[PDB]
Amino acid sequence: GVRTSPTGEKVTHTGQAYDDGDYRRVRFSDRQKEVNENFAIDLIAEQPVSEVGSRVISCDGGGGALGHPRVYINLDKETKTGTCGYCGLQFRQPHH
């Protein structure tokens, strides 16, 4: 989800872009500015929420030892969904 600053420069996923009066834009003249086109926040927002019929489930990021440390997520609260603090995947009980 790369946006463009009113100056014209691409806004990176950290949201920074040199101001109009910033002299530091001169470093990009006759050259380019590296911006990563894949925004992690959007990509993890596109992941569907997993449906599990268990009160507490574990997430390790997939791949077993190739993921993140295994953590357990509580799904008692129905207002929101359980989110992994490492991977960002979302889990939810089958309401109704």
């Binding site: 390790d60 077993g64 030892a65 993921g67 993140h68 440390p69 295994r70």
Partner: protein, 379 residues
């Protein structure tokens, strides 16, 4: 009596010559002083380990092993048998590399340039072994104060054996080119003669002692890892000159091949680092599965292990001589003081006495036979 300066490994050398004779030889060092010992005081022990790769940068894992032994002695722990066997095997490989570099560079400075290429092919093969075991060709950082970082890949031993069964012919070719050549003997025989008592009083060690007939080797008198479980002979000189040291180094290469054979045939099973997670980090699966393992990994990679207070001097038989570390611990995870002892320091200090009454061309031969690398000399 004219005074001239051989300016800039890298060495500045001030001499006064009376015709062809060398009257005084004053080496000037510090052109590669990077302040390693002060930098170590600002690092943890694991963080300070990679400095020893760069100290004597022709024999990397030997310095790694010396530092690891010092830290193990201060921690009051021991590595597992397989780690010790791996350490000795790679120390012998490192000795082969170092002696190849020393002999071929000494020949190249005299004017024999072809064995340099001949044996640097073998050096490249051993660098491939280093890269396969650690991921880096030279600045390996493989030997750790708890053992070794990773286990050997599943096909490393067979390739090491394949390399070791062909190296003796390379040594034979080097000997055919150098050993009986009359020009080489005229360049080396009776050059830089040092007596046994003078070598002892001047702080010499290793080949510099053994070429004068002193029967001393740290792997034999004070064995450290498994060196009491392997069999080899110690070459002893008879005249204390450059030729005897050359012969001694070639014989040490052959004996290193012997020790490598024994190590390959007697590699034991088991773990590679001390099974104590408060010193050695746990496995990745354990760190990603168990709470204690994750806590210990976090603490070992952020703070590092604390070492009980004390001071030790640990020395090993490095390929260049006695390499020692005087390590002081104040009880924290950072060393308080780390003094690094290099044999090249004393050898270069004795260079002045070794070169009395010799030609200007003989000083190059004496420098080559002393096996001086300025990374360890300047630190």
């Amino acid at each position: 009596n004219l005074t001239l300066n051989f300016g800039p490994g890298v060495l500045r050398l001030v001499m006064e010559l009376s015709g062809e004779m060398v009257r005084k030889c004053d080496p000037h060092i510090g052109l590669l002083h990077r302040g390693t010992e002060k930098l170590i005081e600002y690092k943890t022990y694991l963080q300070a380990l990679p400095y020893f790769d760069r100290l004597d940068y022709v024999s990397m894992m030997c310095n790694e092993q010396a530092y690891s032994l010092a830290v193990e002695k201060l921690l009051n722990i021991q590595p597992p048998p397989r780690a010790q066997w791996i350490r000795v095997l790679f120390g012998e490989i490192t000795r082969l590399l170092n002696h190849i570099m020393a002999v071929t560079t000494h020949a190249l400075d005299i004017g024999a340039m072809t064995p340099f290429f001949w044996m640097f092919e073998e050096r490249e093969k051993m660098f491939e072994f280093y890269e396969r075991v650690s991921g880096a060709r030279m600045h390996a950082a493989y030997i750790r104060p708890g053992g070794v970082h990773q286990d050997l890949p599943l096909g490393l031993l067979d390739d090491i054996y394949e390399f070791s069964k062909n190296f003796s012919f390379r040594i034979d070719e080097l000997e055919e080119m150098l050993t009986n050549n009359r020009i080489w003997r005229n360049r080396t025989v009776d050059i830089g003669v040092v007596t046994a008592e003078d070598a002892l009083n001047y702080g010499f060690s290793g080949v510099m002692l053994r070429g004068s007939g002193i029967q001393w080797d740290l792997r034999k008198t004070q064995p450290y890892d498994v060196y009491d479980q392997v069999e080899f002979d110690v070459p002893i000189g008879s005249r204390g000159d450059c030729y005897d040291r050359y012969l001694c180094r070639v014989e040490e290469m052959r004996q290193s091949l012997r020790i490598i054979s024994q190590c390959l045939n007697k590699m034991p099973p088991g773990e590679i680092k001390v099974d104590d997670a408060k010193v050695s980090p746990p496995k990745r699966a354990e760190m990603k599965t168990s709470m204690e393992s994750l806590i210990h990994h976090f603490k070992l990679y952020t703070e590092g292990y604390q070492v009980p207070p004390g001071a030790t001097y640990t020395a090993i038989e490095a390929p260049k001589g006695e390499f020692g570390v005087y390590l002081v611990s104040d009880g924290s995870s950072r060393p308080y003081r780390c003094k690094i002892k290099a044999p090249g320091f004393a050898h270069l200090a004795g260079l002045d006495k070794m070169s009395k009454g010799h030609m200007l061309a003989d000083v190059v031969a004496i420098i080559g036979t002393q096996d001086i690398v300025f990374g360890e000399v300047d630190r």
